[PDB]
Design a protein around this ligand. Structure first.
Ligand code: APC
Ligand code: CL
Ligand code: MG
Length: 158
């Protein structure tokens, strides 16, 4: 199954954390990285004192069940990052999100796939579009169409 995973880091110097996370993703049992998007820099909207995020998308081939994959991404979050005691704004220093999991639709207590809010997030859509411009969602929506309908500002590279 090809799963698409979004990575976000809000560290001031996020490169080493992102690399540790990438290596960890490739180390997941029965899985390996097919492709990684460029690293993108995404703004603090409104309040400026917020730091830039590094965002990227990863295509991961995996034979694991979706919930097993989630187990691993959550483990990697716990191992490679921390929870900011500030607010809900920036929850964790490292965020791993399962955007798509093959052509599967998932709606459980633990897992909503396609990711529940990804169509609202340019920082998820643009890096994904770089590595999968032809992507079609399980319901037939098209990544290209979502970007064509909404007009999200392009992201600069890290
Ligand atoms: N596709 C998916 N990828 C990752 N986590 C997912 C998910 N679908 C559901 N979840 C759930 O999302 C929960 C965490 O949500 P919250 O932490 O409250 C918001 P967040 O994850 O900080 O940022 P987000 O809402 O921008 O994705 C997890 O406990 C996990 O069960
Ligand atoms: Cl999916
Ligand atoms: Mg999340």
């Amino acid at each position: 199954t090809v799963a698409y995973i979004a990575i976000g880091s809000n560290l001031a110097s996020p490169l080493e954390q992102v690399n540790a996370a990438l290596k960890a993703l490739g180390d997941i049992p029965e899985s390996h990285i097919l492709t990684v998007s460029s690293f993108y820099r995404t703004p603090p909207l409104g309040p400026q004192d917020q730091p830039d995020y590094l965002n990227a998308a990863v295509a991961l081939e995996t034979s694991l069940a979706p919930e097993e994959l989630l187990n691993h991404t959550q483990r990697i979050e716990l191992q490679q990052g921390r929870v900011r005691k500030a607010e809900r704004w920036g929850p964790r220093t490292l965020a791993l999100d399962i955007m798509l999991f093959g052509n599967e639709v998932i709606n459980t207590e633990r897992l909503t796939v396609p990711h529940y809010d990804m169509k609202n997030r340019g920082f998820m859509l643009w890096p994904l579009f770089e590595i999968a411009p032809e992507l079609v969602f399980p319901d037939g929506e098209m990544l290209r169409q979502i970007l064509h309908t909404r007009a999200f500002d392009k992201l600069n590279k890290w």
